[PDB]
């Protein structure tokens, strides 16, 4: 499993995601039949978290964790300021 399991630093987690050797990758990704140079958002940061590693009891908790790691400003939203929401594509903040 991943160095990370669901209660690892938050920084650390948004930081391994951002890894170009971590799984997940913020930097081009795909979306409505389209590329782009910057996009993950928690959907895809939750895939990860999964895939990478394991803690979260469902899609549930998964969810919660990654809902957190937003809300700690370790992610970047289009919204008011940031508000997890894994629909609309996002990109890593600081």
Known sequence: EAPLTVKSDMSAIVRVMQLPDSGLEIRDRMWLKITIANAVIGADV????????????????????????LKHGFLRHTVNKITFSEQCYYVFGD
Do not use: C, I, P, Q
């Open 46 to 69: 939750v895939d990860w978290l999964y895939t990478h590693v394991e803690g979260f009891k469902e899609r549930r908790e998964a969810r919660k964790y990654a809902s957190s790691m």
